[PDB]
Structures are given as structure tokens and as C-alpha cells.
Write a protein that binds this ligand. Structure first.
Ligand SMILES: [K+]
Ligand SMILES: [K+]
Ligand SMILES: [K+]
Ligand SMILES: [K+]
Ligand SMILES: [K+]
Ligand SMILES: [K+]
Ligand SMILES: [K+]
Ligand SMILES: [K+]
Ligand SMILES: [K+]
Ligand SMILES: [Mg+2]
Ligand SMILES: [Mg+2]
Ligand SMILES: [Mg+2]
Ligand SMILES: [Mg+2]
Ligand SMILES: [Mg+2]
Ligand SMILES: [Mg+2]
Ligand SMILES: [Mg+2]
Ligand SMILES: [Mg+2]
Ligand SMILES: [Mg+2]
Ligand SMILES: [Mg+2]
Ligand SMILES: [Mg+2]
Ligand SMILES: [Mg+2]
Lengths: 114, 151, 101, 99, 127, 82
RNA sequence: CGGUCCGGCCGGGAACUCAAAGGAGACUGCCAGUGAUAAACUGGAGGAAGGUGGGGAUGACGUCAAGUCAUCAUGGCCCUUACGACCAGGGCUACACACGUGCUACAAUGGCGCAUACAAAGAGAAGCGACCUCGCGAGAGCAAGCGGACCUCAUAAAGUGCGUCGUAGUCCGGAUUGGAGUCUGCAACUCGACUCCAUGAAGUCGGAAUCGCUAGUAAUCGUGGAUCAGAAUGCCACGGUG
């Protein structure tokens, strides 16, 4: 079922299938389901079309899609050409939040090099 | 130990059945000191076995167990620059521990959903002479006949 | 331990008990939730820098009494781990003795 | 009206002497003494590096044992409370008076 | 009258009062099944009264504190045995023969210096 | 992050900035206070921030507001390993 | 026993758990056999415990010209407008890489949600901070009690019952990054801890090889303490299952 995230969730429980939307996690999806008066156990199937329709405008109250990717990128690109310390970290590909770089920074520097 | 002639720490029997053999089986199956979880797995799987194989709850466990007990094992001995697999007869108590340990280790490497369902199927086809547990016994016996020259 | 360091610690203690512990009001009762969100709060925050960089009780390293050793301090005796064992052993510390249990 | 007094010492032999001495001193004055009561003893514990340098794995464990006693006098006639102020209590014990 | 017994285990201490009557078991103002959710604890507690088969002829009033479920069940068995002694004193041998008289003196060994646990040492490497 | 109960700038620089605004734009205002935040009153000024051994010049613009002064003056130099 | 608001909470009791002082107890002491009419060995009784009952402290003459002249002391040498002293900022936290020790995982003996049991040992005055109100939360406001078997830290967690997920890079994993915050502290850019929303790397049990452990031990679950304004996955201790 297409939702405001125009991606398509599937035949799982409602509170979990909503998580397939970028920008909606676990608690936020619970809040969405609560405002529409839908139990968290019902699957995405066996939902009346009006129920889906009232779901998808509740999601509209959050900035959650490739638009959210837009501001995420802009916030990083801002730091980038601004030139602050985190700009240098982001441009060099090194950890940004003051972690340890002498060893053990693999998830940020990528796989091992010789 | 070089000199100690060790005794034997006692083991309490089963609560439900009063069996001194299932107490060992629960000990073999338990992990990280969680005795209750192991008892839940063994009990649920045992009763599933009983109703699948007719009746006779714990002697349905015995009939599969008697199908996997080894009678001769192999010991590796280094001669002078070569080593031989001298086959030696198995002690009585060791026969059960070997038979239980193989069943449990085989009842872990399956694709079933639960541990109770996983273990019950192993306990069933072992009584029917199928399963990795009985194959282990066949392999050990086959290995121990090829070296019967060294007995 | 380099008497210069011992001199620094005694100076810091004397400078702390003169200014603060009485001029700690301006960091508590003006950095407080009330209607003083005007210059009343702002000027106190600005004034707190003008005080000497020392006198802040978070700047005394709590050295050993007999040696000025900066590491391995024990508050109950005020000595370092070296001198406590040495003095414990001759019998200078009442009550203290080797523990086995 | 009742006075309650505590005794703290670093060793049990010295606290026993002071306790048995104070307790009988009041009993002479005609009052009835309630106790003594052995309270649980607080044992502090310390571990220290014994080398000046490295060798972390070789340490030493010490302890301070604080023995404690309690006695209650529940009819302090006006000759007992003062009299207690002039007892030859030891040096290694200290007393606490409460009314 | 009532007969008394103190039994104890890892860290628990149980005191047990036996009275003639019918089988009634109360632990800390609760029934036996309401207290011990672990079914082997129930079997442990009952063991002495099934050996000496005075199981339906006695009231048991029991107060337990300290330790965990298996320690408390262990203490109760020891406390029951001692009190059941104070009842008959002639059925001692067979209670001895089952290992119930012995007060299990096992305790958790203290952590030692340089070891991550009582005996587990850290890893050792040559190079 | 510090509290919403006040941002933090030092006095010895707050005096200098407010004394230099009216007198125009001049040679960069030299400072050691890396730890003082940037105010909207600073926009368009040039400040020479310390980095341990020099005073690197930063020209304050609108987007660098709320940031500490220090994070436009790296203290470590690193050009590769081979 | 009586009272009761069902709470040892009241009168009360000194029995019981417990606290902490003083004793008793275990000695191959007794029995049988073996042994050189020995020393000691096996087994049995009794007993809470049996053969050093369990654990600890306790480290002989000496070895490595082992370590420490940066705890301290000290022979010789060296500096004395500096190799001494004061101050701000930085650095010890860098990052192509390699090793050691740990922690968290790869899931169903499990994850998540609700209900619900059972500890021990500790610390506290420039301290521990209750009840109550506010906040989704970290916390904030007011403020009792406690130098403590009395008050606070402080609701143990594995467990247990119900439900759900159904073998999927997943309702596993929680690294990284963006945003928004609290708290300590003159001040969290370099370089703090924690909270909430969002994101969801590698990882599907690990080559040659190698480490610890003989019983309340290994494995596993939590708790406390010292250092300390704040800042442990480390160290030192404690109990649960086993
Ligand atoms: K998502
Ligand atoms: K010298
Ligand atoms: K620095
Ligand atoms: K770093
Ligand atoms: K490693
Ligand atoms: K670690
Ligand atoms: K910082
Ligand atoms: K996931
Ligand atoms: K701290
Ligand atoms: Mg760090
Ligand atoms: Mg400090
Ligand atoms: Mg443990
Ligand atoms: Mg080493
Ligand atoms: Mg008495
Ligand atoms: Mg040398
Ligand atoms: Mg040197
Ligand atoms: Mg370092
Ligand atoms: Mg608390
Ligand atoms: Mg898988
Ligand atoms: Mg864990
Ligand atoms: Mg801890």
C-alpha cells in the first residue's frame, strides 16, 4: 500500500510495516497509528481503504521522505563548504564526533588498506 | 590427575519422572546455568515424542538411545614416529554420555523452528535408525573395524 | 615533587577559600530560574570570569601530604599508595592491619 | 526520659573494658542499665599497589575494623547523668551521649 | 506442641515449625505452589517427608529469608529435616542415609587479585 | 552542548568587539579565546584566532553564528603518510 | 499471647532468625584389615565437618648487573639571565598501517510488550537525597530524614506467567551521521557523560594456530566500592542460577 512515503509497505503488522518509511522509526510509527485509532496488531492488508487514506495524511505531519534526505544533505553540505572542523572531518572521511582514529575507525574509513 | 582416584558427585534425579538418566540429559542440554529452560525443552520434546511414537514416555527415550550407543571407540597412540588408532572398548557409564552428547549436538544442527521440535525429531528417527546421531555411531564403528588389526 | 608544584597547590587552596565558598552566590542564586533573565543573570555570568582563574575548587589536584605525588591518592589518610603502606607497616596508622578473608 | 550512649573503638578488647566499666558505674548509682548491645562492626577495606613502579598484579589488602556498642539508661536520677561525665574512659575509645 | 528447626544453605536461613495435623505448608504467609514457581524446588522441599512418609500428618509453618530460590529450597529441606528430628529422634539413620542431615557447606569463593573471577585468569600470550 | 540558560562569550573579547564595531573595519582583532561563541554583532569582522602557535584569520559571515570561535582554526597539521 | 487500620503496626515477649564477645568441636581420636611387632596406608562407624574440612595471609639460601635516580632518599656529574620560576593557548585524544587485552553481536535455550518473585556486600556532610509537582526522557522545583542495624543511594537481573514475532541481514545487530536537548564545570571547538527523534555499517560462529578452568569451579545475570566537579566495557569486591 503506497503511503505518503510513496514507497510501498507490505503484509506485516501495522506498527512495523510503517517503519519501512524513511524518517519513521518505531515510536513515531506508534504515534501515527494512535492518532488514526488503529491497533498495532492489524496487518497492512485487511485495512479498509479509508483507513489507509487516514494513515497517509497523518504521515504528512512529519517531514519524512527524500525531502528529509534533502535537508540532511543540505545540513552536511552546509558544514562542508563552511569550513568548520566537522566540515574537515566530513570531507576527509574520518570520524566526526571525536572518536578514536589511531586504531579502530573502520565503519568510517571503510575496509582495510595495505 | 596423576594420582587422585576421584569419587563421584551425586546427581539429583528428575522431578517429574524420578529418572537418573534424564537428569544427566538435562545437564547435557543446559547452557549458561539456565537449568529451568533446559527442563522446559526436554519435557516438552519428550511428551511430543511419547504421543508420536505411541505411548511409554521414557522408554521411548530409551529405545532411541539404545540405537546410538557406541560399543568400541578409537584412541590415537603415537608409536615411534607413526600413530595408530587403537580401538578400545567403551566403559558402561561412558556409553550413555557419548550417546546423549551426540544426540544433543545433532539436535542443534537442524532447520526446525524450536529446540523442542528440533530435539524430538532427532529422538524419533534415531529410534528408527535415521539421523546424524545414528550416523555418528555408524562412522565410529566403521572407523574402529578398519583398525581391528591393532586390537 | 618539584617544590614549585607544592607551592602551586597551597596557593590554590588559599585562593579558593578567600573568594569562593562565600562568593559562590553569584553562580547559584543569580544563575537561577526566575525573572532575572535580564542583565541580572547576564552580568553575573560575565562577572564570574573576572575572578582569578584559580579559586575554583575544581582546580586542586589533591596531592599527597608527605611527597606531593599527584597519582594514587587515598582520601581517608591523605597519603599516596606508597606512603600509606610504609606508614601502615611500622604501626603509625591506628587500627590498620593486614586483611585476610 | 532516657539517655542513650554509643561506644566506638578500633579494637574489641578496649571497648569491652570501657563498656563493662561504664555499665557497672551507672549500676552503682542505683539505676538499671539496658545493654550492652553489640552493633554490627564496620570493616573498611583498602587495596594498594605495593611496587613504586609497574607490576599492577601484586597488591596488598588492608582493613580498619570499627567496633560498636550501645547501652541505655532509662531512669537517669539526678546523680547519674553528671557522674558519667567523670569516668576514666580509655584513649582509643570515644563516647557519644544522647538524651 | 510444636517442634522447631533451623536449616540454611548458600546464603539463606530457614526456620521451620512442625505440628501434628494434616499436610499444610505455608512459606512466608503463602502456599507452597504460590511461593516456589520452580518445580524442582517443590520436589526438594517435599523429599524428607516422602522418605519418612509423614507427608499428610504434619502442618509446616516456615519462614525463609536470604539467598535465591534454590538456596531457599535447600534451606527449607535442611530446616525440615532438623525439626523432623526433634519430632521422633528415632528416624535419624535413614534421614542421614539420604544426605539430609549434612549442612551443605559450599559457598561462593571470593574474587582474588589478578584474576577476573575466583579462578578464571586473563589470557596469557607468549609474544 | 551547554545550556539554553545563556550562551558563553568572554568579557575581554565582548569589550573588544563592541568597541570595534563603531570604529569600522580594521586589522583583524587578535584573540586567544577559542572558547567564546560567535554573536550576530560579529558579522563582517575579521578575527585572528589562536591555534597554539599562530593567529589564523577568519572572516565572520552570517552562517558562522552560534559556533564556537575555535572550530575555524585547526590545531593539528596532517598531510598523508606516504 | 491480646490489640489491629492487615502493616511487627501497638501492648508485649527473649523463644527464633540476627548482631558480637566468650567457649566446645577433628585429633588417624575409635574399629577392621595391610605393613618390617614400625612410619604410614586402604575401608567402616560416629559426626555439621575426616584425614592439610574449604579459602586466604604467610614467599627459605639465592637467580635474572631483572624494574624503579619520574613516590622518596641518595654518591658522582651537569645548569645557575636558565636545563630554574610565572601565564594564556595548544598537545599528550594525530592516522597509511601492525600487534596485545577487553566489550557488543551474528539470533528462536531468542527479540519485543505487559504482570510478577527471590540477594549479598557496601558508601554518605562543600555528602547521600526521600515524599510531592513538572518533563516522553536525561533531569528540574520544593524539601523531610541521616554521621546512619533507624534515613538515602536502591524497584536486583537472569527467573516466572501470558501474548507476539516464525528463520528473513529479519521485530537480529546498534556501528555511523543529522537534529534537538539536560548536567557538571570560569569554560565541553579541538576533547565529557547521558537523553529523545531520525538513520540502520560490518556481522549469518570465524585459516594456520592458540587460552582458562577439576565444584559452588567454568559459563551466565546483575549489584557495590576506590579515583572523582563531571567522566569505566578497566580494577577491586558481593550475591543469583549453576
Ligand atoms: K525507517
Ligand atoms: K642522584
Ligand atoms: K589540550
Ligand atoms: K581523536
Ligand atoms: K581482539
Ligand atoms: K574493552
Ligand atoms: K570537552
Ligand atoms: K533492523
Ligand atoms: K564520579
Ligand atoms: Mg573519548
Ligand atoms: Mg580534578
Ligand atoms: Mg559470581
Ligand atoms: Mg603480560
Ligand atoms: Mg536468649
Ligand atoms: Mg639492567
Ligand atoms: Mg629518566
Ligand atoms: Mg596516553
Ligand atoms: Mg536512588
Ligand atoms: Mg540466520
Ligand atoms: Mg550480557
Ligand atoms: Mg561494577
Amino acid at each position: 500500500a503506497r503511503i505518503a512515503g510513496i514507497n510501498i509497505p507490505d503484509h506485516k503488522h501495522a506498527v512495523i510495516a510503517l517503519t519501512s518509511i524513511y524518517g519513521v522509526g518505531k515510536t513515531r510509527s506508534k504515534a501515527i497509528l494512535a492518532a488514526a485509532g488503529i491497533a498495532e496488531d492489524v496487518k497492512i492488508s485487511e485495512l479498509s481503504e479509508g483507513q489507509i487514506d487516514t494513515l497517509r495524511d497523518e504521515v504528512a505531519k512529519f517531514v519524512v521522505e527524500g525531502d528529509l534526505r534533502r535537508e540532511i544533505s543540505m545540513s552536511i553540505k552546509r558544514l562542508m563548504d563552511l569550513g568548520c572542523y566537522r566540515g574537515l572531518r566530513h570531507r576527509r572521511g574520518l570520524p566526526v564526533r571525536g572518536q578514536r582514529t589511531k586504531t579502530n575507525a573502520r565503519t568510517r574509513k571503510g575496509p582495510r588498506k595495505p | 590427575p596423576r594420582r587422585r582416584v576421584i569419587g563421584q558427585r551425586k546427581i539429583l534425579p528428575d522431578p517429574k519422572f524420578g529418572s537418573e538418566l534424564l537428569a544427566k540429559f538435562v545437564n547435557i542440554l543446559m547452557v549458561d546455568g539456565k537449568k529451568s529452560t533446559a527442563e522446559s525443552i526436554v519435557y516438552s520434546a519428550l511428551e511430543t515424542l511419547a504421543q508420536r511414537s505411541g505411548k511409554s514416555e521414557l522408554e521411548a527415550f530409551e529405545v532411541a538411545l539404545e540405537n546410538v550407543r557406541p560399543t568400541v571407540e578409537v584412541k590415537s597412540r603415537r608409536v615411534g614416529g607413526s600413530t595408530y588408532q587403537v580401538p578400545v572398548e567403551v566403559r558402561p557409564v561412558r556409553r550413555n554420555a557419548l550417546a546423549m552428547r551426540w544426540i544433543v549436538e545433532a539436535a542443534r544442527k537442524r532447520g526446525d523452528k524450536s529446540m523442542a521440535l528440533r530435539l524430538a525429531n532427532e529422538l524419533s528417527d534415531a529410534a528408527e535408525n535415521k539421523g546424524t546421531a545414528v550416523k555418528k555411531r555408524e562412522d565410529v564403528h566403521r572407523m574402529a573395524e578398519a583398525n581391528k588389526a591393532f586390537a | 615533587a618539584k617544590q614549585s608544584m607544592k607551592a602551586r597547590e597551597v596557593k590554590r587552596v588559599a585562593l579558593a577559600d578567600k573568594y569562593f565558598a562565600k562568593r559562590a552566590e553569584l553562580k547559584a542564586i543569580i544563575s537561577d530560574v526566575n525573572a532575572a533573565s535580564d542583565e541580572d543573570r547576564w552580568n553575573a555570568v560575565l562577572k564570574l570570569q573576572t575572578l582569578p582563574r584559580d579559586s575554583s575548587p575544581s582546580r586542586q589536584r589533591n596531592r599527597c601530604r608527605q611527597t606531593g605525588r599527584p597519582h594514587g591518592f587515598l582520601r581517608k589518610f591523605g597519603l599516596s599508595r606508597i606512603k600509606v603502606r610504609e606508614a601502615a607497616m611500622r604501626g603509625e596508622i591506628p587500627g590498620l592491619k593486614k586483611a585476610s578473608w | 526520659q532516657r539517655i542513650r550512649i554509643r561506644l566506638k573503638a578500633f579494637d574489641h578488647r578496649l571497648i569491652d573494658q570501657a563498656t563493662a566499666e561504664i555499665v557497672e558505674t551507672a549500676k552503682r548509682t542505683g539505676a538499671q542499665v539496658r545493654g550492652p548491645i553489640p552493633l554490627p562492626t564496620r570493616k573498611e577495606r583498602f587495596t594498594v599497589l605495593i611496587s613504586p613502579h609497574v607490576n599492577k598484579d601484586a597488591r596488598d589488602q588492608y582493613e580498619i575494623r570499627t567496633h560498636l556498642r550501645l547501652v541505655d539508661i532509662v531512669e537517669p536520677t539526678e546523680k547519674t547523668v553528671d557522674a558519667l561525665m567523670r569516668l576514666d574512659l580509655a584513649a582509643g575509645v570515644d563516647v557519644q551521649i544522647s538524651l | 506442641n510444636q517442634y522447631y528447626g533451623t536449616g540454611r544453605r548458600k546464603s539463606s536461613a530457614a526456620r521451620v515449625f512442625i505440628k501434628p495435623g494434616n499436610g499444610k505448608i505455608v512459606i512466608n504467609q503463602r502456599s507452597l505452589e504460590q511461593y516456589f514457581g520452580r518445580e524442582t524446588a517443590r520436589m526438594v522441599v517435599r523429599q524428607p517427608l516422602e522418605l519418612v512418609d509423614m507427608v499428610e500428618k504434619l502442618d509446616l509453618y516456615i519462614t525463609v529469608k536470604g539467598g535465591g530460590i534454590s538456596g531457599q529450597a535447600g534451606a527449607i529441606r535442611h530446616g525440615i529435616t532438623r525439626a523432623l528430628m526433634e519430632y521422633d529422634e528415632s528416624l535419624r539413620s535413614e534421614l542421614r542415609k539420604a544426605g539430609f542431615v549434612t549442612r551443605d557447606a559450599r559457598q561462593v569463593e571470593r574474587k582474588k587479585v589478578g584474576l577476573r573471577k575466583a579462578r578464571r585468569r586473563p589470557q596469557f600470550s607468549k609474544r | 552542548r551547554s545550556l539554553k540558560k545563556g550562551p558563553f562569550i568572554d568579557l575581554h573579547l565582548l569589550k573588544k568587539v563592541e568597541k570595534a564595531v563603531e570604529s569600522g573595519d580594521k586589522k583583524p582583532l587578535r584573540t586567544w579565546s577559542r572558547r567564546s561563541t560567535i554573536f550576530p554583532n560579529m558579522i563582517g569582522l575579521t578575527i585572528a584566532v589562536h591555534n597554539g602557535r599562530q593567529h589564523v584569520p577568519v572572516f565572520v559571515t552570517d552562517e558562522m553564528v552560534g559556533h564556537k570561535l575555535g572550530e575555524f582554526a585547526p590545531t593539528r597539521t596532517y598531510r598523508g603518510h606516504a
